Design a protein around this ligand. Sequence first.
Ligand SMILES: [Ca+2]
Ligand SMILES: [K+]
Ligand SMILES: [K+]
Ligand SMILES: [K+]
Length: 133
Amino acid sequence: EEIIWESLSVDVGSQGNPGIVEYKGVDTKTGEVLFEREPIPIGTNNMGEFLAIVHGLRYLKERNSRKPIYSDSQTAIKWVKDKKAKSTLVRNEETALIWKLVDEAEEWLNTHTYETPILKWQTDKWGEIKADY
RNA sequence: ACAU
DNA sequence: CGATGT
Ligand SMILES: [Ca+2]
Ligand SMILES: [K+]
Ligand SMILES: [K+]
Ligand SMILES: [K+]
């Protein structure tokens, strides 16, 4: 319905898909950049969006924050809910780094708890997510 | 078809 | 136009 302004928004950016992947998280209200991941040489859009959400969960938990997370990614929201990133990206030396991060993100989800609502940013109604690149 |  | 996903 309406934007929950007291929230964290995440977004992925890439050069190619697959290609160089980065992500960041911002304060939805203020646009302040709260975290930014160093570019990962090869990944997919959906792996990046998944890592961004899980990073947000870890960031908020560390700070004892109950704010929700917005993502515009139907895919990544489901992967987090399932605790399983069903990526099609081949596993090889080129993709080892992103797959390590994805494996570790799944492992974190399987060993920690959180109440953080993970909410769909409604781009069609609200425009671009505030974490946009 | 929808979300990127 | 190409790719990643449910
Ligand atoms: Ca974006
Ligand atoms: K996005
Ligand atoms: K983006
Ligand atoms: K498609």
